[PDB]
Amino acid sequence: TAASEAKNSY
Amino acid sequence: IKEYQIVDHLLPGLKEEVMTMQSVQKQTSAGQRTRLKAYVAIGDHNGHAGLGVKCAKEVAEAIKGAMIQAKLAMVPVRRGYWGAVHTVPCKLTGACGSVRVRLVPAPRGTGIVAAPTPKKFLILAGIEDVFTQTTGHTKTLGNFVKATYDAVRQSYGFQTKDL
Amino acid sequence: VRVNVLADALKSITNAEKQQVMIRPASKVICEFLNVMMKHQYITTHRSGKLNGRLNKCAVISPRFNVTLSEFDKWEANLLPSRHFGALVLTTSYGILDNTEARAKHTGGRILGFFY
Amino acid sequence: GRMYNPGRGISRRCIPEDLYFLMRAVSVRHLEKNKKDKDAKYHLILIESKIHRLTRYYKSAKVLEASFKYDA
Amino acid sequence: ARGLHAARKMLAQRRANKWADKEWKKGKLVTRYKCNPLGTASHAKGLETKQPNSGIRKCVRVRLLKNGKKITAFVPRDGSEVLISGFGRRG
Amino acid sequence: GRCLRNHSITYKTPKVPYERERFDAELKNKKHMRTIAKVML
Amino acid sequence: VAHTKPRSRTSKAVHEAYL
RNA sequence: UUGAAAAAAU
RNA sequence: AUCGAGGACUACCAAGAUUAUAACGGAUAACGAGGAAUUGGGGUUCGACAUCGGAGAGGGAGCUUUACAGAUGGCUACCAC
RNA sequence: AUUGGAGGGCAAGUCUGGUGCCAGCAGCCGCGGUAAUUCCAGCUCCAAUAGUGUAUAUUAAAGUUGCUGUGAUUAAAACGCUCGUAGUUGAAUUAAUUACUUUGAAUAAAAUAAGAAAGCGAAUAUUCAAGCAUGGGACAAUGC
RNA sequence: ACGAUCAGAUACCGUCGUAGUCCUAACUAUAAACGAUGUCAACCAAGGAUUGGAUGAAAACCUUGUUCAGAACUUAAAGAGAAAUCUUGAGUUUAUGGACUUCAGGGGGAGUAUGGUCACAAGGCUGAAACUUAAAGGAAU
């Protein structure tokens, strides 16, 4: 779940 | 090879070239403490090249210690073919300081298309055909040869298809 | 924003091989780019689902310049380490190929990228 | 990232009208009593540009007939 | 811009940036016909040193036939209508 | 153009005017196909 | 299935319509 | 607490 | 009217044409092309001047003759010689 | 047989007479303030040679104009900041034109390259930007 | 404006004092307006701590784990750079091409002249050339 990887540069 | 005589043992008759003598100075209370720094290049003309630097008070003494360092700094030069040994096997660049010297494989006929300084070292290494492009302050001789030396120093690291 | 999946993919591969690698968006060009890179041996989710010491550097070329057959010599001379090692990747009228068969299929077209 | 703010949130559902809801435009055009609220005025422009970007999009999708023009 | 269809900007971008070139601009704007005493010509018939060097430079002032402007000209050698032709440095 | 008859140069002076490694080697006076080979290779 | 006419003849349009 | 200056080139 | 299409022109009708993908306007020590110089690739600069096309005969303008000229080593008038 | 040069760049004298920051030389670094490798002379040798100096301009050098290919903390150089039109760039996915791509047609000579400078039948190939015909539809743009 | 100090002191030191310092309304639109570092997107070594979450453990607050967003900090034998330094980029660039905008071309003359335009004004924005000169400048010893 996209949340599971949701709890960064360029 | 922590000793300079061993390269003189397995590589006899190393044809010698003093690239340049460069006088440095150290300002002190009395005045300037000047020493002469000499860049020398060694190496038989069959894929072995060496560059060493030493600085001392006497011209003769500095050169003698300079050949030692060039002898200690021994590297193999990988030669190859352009289309069909005379030239580098691929495109290599030597990353000195502001100087960046790039080697491009050249056909059988063309000589060393390069500045006088990297030419004398590229002749020593045993290459006869090469294309070179420079990027930086090439009037700095010491960084010029080091950029040249570095370019061939990495020729035996690029794992090509045949390797 | 993500403009080119191919550009992102190949940069992900190079940084890993410099240091298996993962590519999150998969397209019709990303995968069949690899089939060229695999037949040279260089390489061993409902939402466009998601290395052996040989790859040196693989990169894409920004806007895909139409390549004539006569123009092949200029591109290889620029982007290839030697005359025996690298490989271009071309998208042509007969699929995504490289400079070998596209020279043999007798066609030109746009250029995707390369790999040493 | 966010359209106007520099925040980059990734709050999402994970599967195993909107133009109407932005006229927020009326609910702040509040500016009558608070004429000195420059924060509200700057944010009013941002919401309006969201409408025109959505207005332009729906017309080319033929959702809205191309006579639509939101006013005050 | 780098895209395949952005040939208008880079062509336009280069034209603007060329004007920054001191050498290139001098050869296109109108000063070689009004500010150059020699114009675009090679020769021109007509009628103390810096700090660490001491002495006197013998020189000459010349009025040109065509323009009429007055210019200062050096004499070539030791103990040395006049034809004047620049110096080592151009302009 | 100026003349219908053709003409050519039969020599080219070196780029560097003074170099000792060339003065000795060259020493009445001091007055093509390799690339042609190259293009087909 | 034609060479690649409207979107009413295209494959996933007709092969769904066929379906 | 006050305390300014050192003719030109080697 | 023209050798002939056409605002080329005349009368009536309409409000239209171009423009940021640079219109309109300004500068050139600008006749254009085939080409030349120099170049690793890419390019930069020049091309009045051999050959092709254009335009001119001190400046405009108006004509004659003829199959072809707005001819000028033909004419007419003005300006300047 | 000349032209320029002999401190460096850059090949060539740490030879002899005067001049004394003067005359002067020096494209730049600079040399000359009385013992000048640079001035004015004399000798010698250095490069090229019936040619060689000087000035101006084109090109290369110049990756110091950057498509290939530049830089933007501190050397010159990120608009004080956001919105926004034109422009440019725009995720994956499907078994009519245009762009793209392959072949041809057609394409003044001279010239370029090519089968002592010259001269005269080269398949001589060009020579792009367009335009015509054609096999292909992978990457693309335009509505359906 | 005074009193000092001083060679003088038209300044720093002390005292007094108009404009201003405050609010309203309308103008001005510039700062070392700086992180001297444009915006957006992918990838990239090792750590402790921190601001708001949610999900477990532990009885709202504190202690622990997990996964995001945010301001940072520590180490680097690596990568980059001229170096100082940068590392969540100033890395993935001669092995040179992810998308777009803006700016620069030795130092002065000069942000000056002329012209245009905005403001009541001070001024802002756009902005040369003549001529002059072998350095000006950066980071480190």
Short mmCIF file of all heavy atoms in Angstrom, two decimals, chain D residues 26-63:
data_model
loop_
_atom_site.label_atom_id
_atom_site.label_comp_id
_atom_site.label_asym_id
_atom_site.label_seq_id
_atom_site.Cartn_x
_atom_site.Cartn_y
_atom_site.Cartn_z
N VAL D 26 -15.84 32.19 -3.45
CA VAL D 26 -16.88 33.05 -2.90
C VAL D 26 -16.72 33.20 -1.39
O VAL D 26 -16.90 34.28 -0.83
CB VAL D 26 -18.27 32.52 -3.28
CG1 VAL D 26 -19.31 32.96 -2.27
CG2 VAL D 26 -18.65 32.99 -4.67
N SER D 27 -16.35 32.11 -0.71
CA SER D 27 -16.29 32.13 0.75
C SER D 27 -15.25 33.10 1.28
O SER D 27 -15.28 33.43 2.46
CB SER D 27 -16.00 30.73 1.28
OG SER D 27 -15.60 30.78 2.64
N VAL D 28 -14.32 33.56 0.43
CA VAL D 28 -13.35 34.57 0.83
C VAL D 28 -13.58 35.91 0.15
O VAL D 28 -12.97 36.91 0.56
CB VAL D 28 -11.90 34.09 0.58
CG1 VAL D 28 -11.74 32.66 1.04
CG2 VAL D 28 -11.54 34.23 -0.88
N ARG D 29 -14.45 35.98 -0.84
CA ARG D 29 -14.72 37.24 -1.52
C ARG D 29 -15.99 37.88 -0.99
O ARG D 29 -16.10 38.18 0.20
CB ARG D 29 -14.83 37.01 -3.03
CG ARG D 29 -15.03 38.28 -3.81
CD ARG D 29 -13.97 38.44 -4.88
NE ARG D 29 -13.95 37.33 -5.82
CZ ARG D 29 -13.18 37.28 -6.90
NH1 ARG D 29 -12.35 38.26 -7.21
NH2 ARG D 29 -13.24 36.21 -7.69
N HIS D 30 -15.64 37.66 2.42
CA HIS D 30 -14.86 37.87 3.63
C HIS D 30 -13.93 39.06 3.49
O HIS D 30 -13.65 39.76 4.45
CB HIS D 30 -14.05 36.62 3.97
CG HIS D 30 -13.07 36.82 5.09
ND1 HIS D 30 -11.71 36.90 4.89
CD2 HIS D 30 -13.27 36.97 6.43
CE1 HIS D 30 -11.11 37.09 6.05
NE2 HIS D 30 -12.03 37.14 7.00
N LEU D 31 -13.45 39.29 2.26
CA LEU D 31 -12.58 40.43 2.00
C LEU D 31 -13.29 41.77 2.16
O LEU D 31 -12.62 42.80 2.17
CB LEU D 31 -11.99 40.33 0.60
CG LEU D 31 -10.52 39.96 0.46
CD1 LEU D 31 -10.30 38.50 0.81
CD2 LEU D 31 -10.05 40.23 -0.96
N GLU D 32 -14.63 41.77 2.24
CA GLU D 32 -15.35 43.03 2.37
C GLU D 32 -15.07 43.71 3.70
O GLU D 32 -14.73 44.89 3.75
CB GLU D 32 -16.85 42.79 2.19
CG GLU D 32 -17.33 42.91 0.76
CD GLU D 32 -16.39 42.26 -0.23
OE1 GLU D 32 -16.20 41.02 -0.16
OE2 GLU D 32 -15.83 42.97 -1.08
N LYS D 33 -15.21 42.97 4.80
CA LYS D 33 -14.95 43.55 6.11
C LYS D 33 -13.46 43.66 6.38
O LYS D 33 -13.01 44.63 7.01
CB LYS D 33 -15.64 42.73 7.20
CG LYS D 33 -17.15 42.80 7.16
CD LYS D 33 -17.79 41.77 8.07
CE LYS D 33 -19.21 42.17 8.42
NZ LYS D 33 -19.26 42.93 9.70
N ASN D 34 -12.68 42.69 5.93
CA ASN D 34 -11.24 42.69 6.14
C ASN D 34 -10.57 43.13 4.85
O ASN D 34 -10.14 42.33 4.02
CB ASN D 34 -10.76 41.31 6.59
CG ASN D 34 -11.66 40.70 7.64
OD1 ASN D 34 -12.28 39.67 7.42
ND2 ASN D 34 -11.73 41.35 8.80
N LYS D 35 -10.49 44.45 4.67
CA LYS D 35 -9.85 45.00 3.48
C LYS D 35 -8.34 45.07 3.61
O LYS D 35 -7.65 45.23 2.59
CB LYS D 35 -10.42 46.39 3.19
CG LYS D 35 -10.43 46.75 1.71
CD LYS D 35 -11.30 47.97 1.43
CE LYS D 35 -12.65 47.88 2.14
NZ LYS D 35 -13.58 46.95 1.45
N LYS D 36 -7.80 44.95 4.82
CA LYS D 36 -6.36 45.02 5.04
C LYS D 36 -5.70 43.65 5.06
O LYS D 36 -4.47 43.57 5.17
CB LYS D 36 -6.06 45.74 6.36
CG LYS D 36 -5.43 47.10 6.19
CD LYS D 36 -5.10 47.73 7.53
CE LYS D 36 -3.82 47.16 8.11
NZ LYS D 36 -3.73 47.39 9.58
N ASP D 37 -6.48 42.57 4.96
CA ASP D 37 -5.94 41.21 5.00
C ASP D 37 -5.28 40.91 3.67
O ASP D 37 -5.90 40.39 2.74
CB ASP D 37 -7.05 40.22 5.32
CG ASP D 37 -6.54 38.83 5.61
OD1 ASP D 37 -5.36 38.54 5.31
OD2 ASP D 37 -7.32 38.01 6.13
N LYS D 38 -3.99 41.24 3.56
CA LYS D 38 -3.26 40.94 2.34
C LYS D 38 -2.97 39.46 2.19
O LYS D 38 -2.75 38.99 1.07
CB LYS D 38 -1.96 41.74 2.29
CG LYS D 38 -2.13 43.22 2.52
CD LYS D 38 -1.97 43.99 1.23
CE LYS D 38 -1.75 45.46 1.49
NZ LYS D 38 -1.71 46.22 0.21
N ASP D 39 -2.94 38.71 3.29
CA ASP D 39 -2.77 37.27 3.20
C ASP D 39 -3.95 36.64 2.46
O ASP D 39 -3.76 35.76 1.62
CB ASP D 39 -2.63 36.67 4.60
CG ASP D 39 -2.31 35.18 4.58
OD1 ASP D 39 -2.16 34.61 3.48
OD2 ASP D 39 -2.23 34.58 5.67
N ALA D 40 -5.16 37.08 2.77
CA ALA D 40 -6.33 36.54 2.09
C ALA D 40 -6.33 36.90 0.61
O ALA D 40 -6.73 36.09 -0.23
CB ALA D 40 -7.61 37.05 2.76
N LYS D 41 -5.88 38.12 0.27
CA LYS D 41 -5.89 38.55 -1.12
C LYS D 41 -4.92 37.72 -1.96
O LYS D 41 -5.25 37.33 -3.08
CB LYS D 41 -5.55 40.03 -1.21
CG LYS D 41 -6.52 40.91 -0.44
CD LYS D 41 -6.20 42.38 -0.58
CE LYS D 41 -7.31 43.23 0.03
NZ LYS D 41 -6.84 44.58 0.45
N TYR D 42 -3.73 37.45 -1.43
CA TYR D 42 -2.77 36.62 -2.16
C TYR D 42 -3.31 35.21 -2.36
O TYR D 42 -3.12 34.61 -3.42
CB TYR D 42 -1.43 36.59 -1.41
CG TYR D 42 -0.64 35.32 -1.60
CD1 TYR D 42 0.07 35.08 -2.77
CD2 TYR D 42 -0.58 34.36 -0.60
CE1 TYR D 42 0.79 33.92 -2.94
CE2 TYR D 42 0.14 33.20 -0.76
CZ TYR D 42 0.82 32.98 -1.93
OH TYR D 42 1.54 31.82 -2.09
N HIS D 43 -3.97 34.67 -1.34
CA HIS D 43 -4.55 33.34 -1.46
C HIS D 43 -5.81 33.33 -2.31
O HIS D 43 -6.17 32.28 -2.85
CB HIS D 43 -4.85 32.77 -0.08
CG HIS D 43 -3.65 32.21 0.60
ND1 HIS D 43 -3.43 32.34 1.96
CD2 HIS D 43 -2.60 31.51 0.12
CE1 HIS D 43 -2.29 31.75 2.27
NE2 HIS D 43 -1.77 31.23 1.18
N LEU D 44 -6.48 34.47 -2.45
CA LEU D 44 -7.61 34.55 -3.37
C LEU D 44 -7.16 34.37 -4.81
O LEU D 44 -7.82 33.69 -5.60
CB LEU D 44 -8.34 35.87 -3.19
CG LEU D 44 -9.37 36.22 -4.27
CD1 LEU D 44 -10.52 35.22 -4.26
CD2 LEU D 44 -9.88 37.64 -4.08
N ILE D 45 -6.02 34.97 -5.18
CA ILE D 45 -5.50 34.83 -6.53
C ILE D 45 -5.14 33.38 -6.82
O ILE D 45 -5.42 32.86 -7.90
CB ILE D 45 -4.29 35.77 -6.74
CG1 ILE D 45 -4.74 37.23 -6.70
CG2 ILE D 45 -3.61 35.47 -8.05
CD1 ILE D 45 -3.60 38.20 -6.73
N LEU D 46 -4.50 32.72 -5.85
CA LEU D 46 -4.10 31.33 -6.05
C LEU D 46 -5.31 30.44 -6.31
O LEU D 46 -5.27 29.59 -7.21
CB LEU D 46 -3.34 30.83 -4.82
CG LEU D 46 -2.01 31.52 -4.53
CD1 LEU D 46 -1.27 30.77 -3.45
CD2 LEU D 46 -1.18 31.60 -5.79
N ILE D 47 -6.38 30.62 -5.55
CA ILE D 47 -7.58 29.81 -5.77
C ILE D 47 -8.20 30.14 -7.11
O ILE D 47 -8.73 29.25 -7.80
CB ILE D 47 -8.57 30.01 -4.61
CG1 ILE D 47 -7.93 29.62 -3.28
CG2 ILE D 47 -9.82 29.20 -4.84
CD1 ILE D 47 -8.72 30.06 -2.08
N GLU D 48 -8.17 31.41 -7.52
CA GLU D 48 -8.75 31.78 -8.81
C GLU D 48 -8.00 31.13 -9.96
O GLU D 48 -8.63 30.63 -10.91
CB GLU D 48 -8.74 33.30 -8.97
CG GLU D 48 -10.03 33.97 -8.55
CD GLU D 48 -9.98 35.47 -8.70
OE1 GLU D 48 -8.87 36.01 -8.85
OE2 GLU D 48 -11.05 36.11 -8.67
N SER D 49 -6.67 31.11 -9.91
CA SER D 49 -5.91 30.47 -10.97
C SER D 49 -6.19 28.98 -11.04
O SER D 49 -6.13 28.38 -12.12
CB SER D 49 -4.42 30.72 -10.77
OG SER D 49 -4.14 32.11 -10.75
N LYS D 50 -6.50 28.36 -9.90
CA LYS D 50 -6.95 26.97 -9.91
C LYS D 50 -8.24 26.83 -10.71
O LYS D 50 -8.43 25.82 -11.40
CB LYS D 50 -7.16 26.47 -8.48
CG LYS D 50 -6.05 25.59 -7.96
CD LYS D 50 -6.19 25.40 -6.47
CE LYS D 50 -4.89 24.94 -5.85
NZ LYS D 50 -4.91 25.04 -4.37
N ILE D 51 -9.13 27.81 -10.61
CA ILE D 51 -10.39 27.75 -11.34
C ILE D 51 -10.15 27.87 -12.83
O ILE D 51 -10.68 27.09 -13.63
CB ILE D 51 -11.35 28.83 -10.83
CG1 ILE D 51 -11.55 28.71 -9.32
CG2 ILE D 51 -12.68 28.73 -11.55
CD1 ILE D 51 -12.32 29.86 -8.71
N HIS D 52 -9.35 28.86 -13.24
CA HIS D 52 -9.11 29.08 -14.66
C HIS D 52 -8.35 27.92 -15.29
O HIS D 52 -8.59 27.59 -16.46
CB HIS D 52 -8.34 30.39 -14.87
CG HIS D 52 -8.95 31.56 -14.17
ND1 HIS D 52 -10.25 31.57 -13.71
CD2 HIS D 52 -8.44 32.78 -13.85
CE1 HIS D 52 -10.51 32.73 -13.13
NE2 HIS D 52 -9.42 33.48 -13.21
N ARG D 53 -7.44 27.30 -14.55
CA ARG D 53 -6.80 26.08 -15.03
C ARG D 53 -7.81 24.95 -15.17
O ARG D 53 -7.73 24.15 -16.11
CB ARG D 53 -5.66 25.69 -14.10
CG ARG D 53 -4.38 26.46 -14.38
CD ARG D 53 -3.36 26.34 -13.27
NE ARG D 53 -2.02 26.23 -13.81
CZ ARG D 53 -0.91 26.19 -13.09
NH1 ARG D 53 -0.94 26.35 -11.78
NH2 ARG D 53 0.26 26.01 -13.69
N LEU D 54 -8.76 24.86 -14.25
CA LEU D 54 -9.82 23.87 -14.37
C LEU D 54 -10.87 24.27 -15.39
O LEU D 54 -11.41 23.42 -16.11
CB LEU D 54 -10.48 23.63 -13.01
CG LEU D 54 -9.68 22.76 -12.05
CD1 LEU D 54 -10.44 22.61 -10.75
CD2 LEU D 54 -9.39 21.41 -12.67
N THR D 55 -11.18 25.57 -15.48
CA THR D 55 -12.10 26.05 -16.49
C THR D 55 -11.58 25.74 -17.89
O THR D 55 -12.32 25.22 -18.74
CB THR D 55 -12.31 27.56 -16.33
OG1 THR D 55 -13.04 27.82 -15.13
CG2 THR D 55 -13.06 28.13 -17.51
N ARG D 56 -10.31 26.04 -18.14
CA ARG D 56 -9.72 25.79 -19.45
C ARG D 56 -9.71 24.30 -19.77
O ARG D 56 -9.89 23.90 -20.93
CB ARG D 56 -8.31 26.36 -19.51
CG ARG D 56 -7.78 26.59 -20.91
CD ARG D 56 -6.28 26.84 -20.91
NE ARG D 56 -5.78 27.25 -19.60
CZ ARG D 56 -5.61 28.51 -19.22
NH1 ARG D 56 -5.89 29.52 -20.03
NH2 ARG D 56 -5.15 28.77 -18.00
N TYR D 57 -9.49 23.46 -18.76
CA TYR D 57 -9.40 22.02 -18.99
C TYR D 57 -10.75 21.43 -19.35
O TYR D 57 -10.86 20.63 -20.29
CB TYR D 57 -8.82 21.32 -17.77
CG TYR D 57 -9.11 19.84 -17.77
CD1 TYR D 57 -8.55 19.01 -18.72
CD2 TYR D 57 -9.94 19.27 -16.81
CE1 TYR D 57 -8.82 17.66 -18.73
CE2 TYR D 57 -10.21 17.92 -16.82
CZ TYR D 57 -9.64 17.12 -17.78
OH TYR D 57 -9.89 15.78 -17.79
N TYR D 58 -11.79 21.80 -18.61
CA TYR D 58 -13.09 21.17 -18.83
C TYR D 58 -13.70 21.57 -20.16
O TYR D 58 -14.46 20.80 -20.74
CB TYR D 58 -14.04 21.52 -17.69
CG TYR D 58 -13.86 20.66 -16.47
CD1 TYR D 58 -13.59 21.22 -15.23
CD2 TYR D 58 -13.95 19.28 -16.55
CE1 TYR D 58 -13.42 20.43 -14.11
CE2 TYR D 58 -13.78 18.48 -15.44
CZ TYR D 58 -13.52 19.06 -14.23
OH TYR D 58 -13.35 18.28 -13.12
N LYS D 59 -13.38 22.76 -20.66
CA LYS D 59 -13.91 23.18 -21.95
C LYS D 59 -13.39 22.30 -23.07
O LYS D 59 -14.16 21.81 -23.90
CB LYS D 59 -13.57 24.65 -22.20
CG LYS D 59 -14.38 25.61 -21.37
CD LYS D 59 -14.01 27.05 -21.67
CE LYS D 59 -14.88 27.99 -20.87
NZ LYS D 59 -14.37 29.38 -20.88
N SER D 60 -12.07 22.08 -23.11
CA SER D 60 -11.49 21.23 -24.14
C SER D 60 -11.90 19.77 -23.99
O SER D 60 -11.83 19.01 -24.96
CB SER D 60 -9.96 21.34 -24.11
OG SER D 60 -9.55 22.68 -24.33
N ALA D 61 -12.33 19.36 -22.80
CA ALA D 61 -12.90 18.04 -22.61
C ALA D 61 -14.39 18.02 -22.92
O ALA D 61 -15.02 16.96 -22.79
CB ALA D 61 -12.66 17.56 -21.18
N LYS D 62 -14.97 19.15 -23.30
CA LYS D 62 -16.39 19.30 -23.63
C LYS D 62 -17.30 19.03 -22.44
O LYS D 62 -18.52 18.92 -22.61
CB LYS D 62 -16.78 18.41 -24.81
CG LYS D 62 -15.99 18.71 -26.07
CD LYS D 62 -15.82 20.21 -26.25
CE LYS D 62 -14.44 20.54 -26.79
NZ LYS D 62 -14.09 21.97 -26.56
N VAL D 63 -16.74 18.92 -21.23
CA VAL D 63 -17.57 18.83 -20.03
C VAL D 63 -18.38 20.11 -19.87
O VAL D 63 -19.59 20.07 -19.64
CB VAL D 63 -16.69 18.56 -18.80
CG1 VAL D 63 -17.53 18.59 -17.53
CG2 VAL D 63 -15.97 17.24 -18.94
#
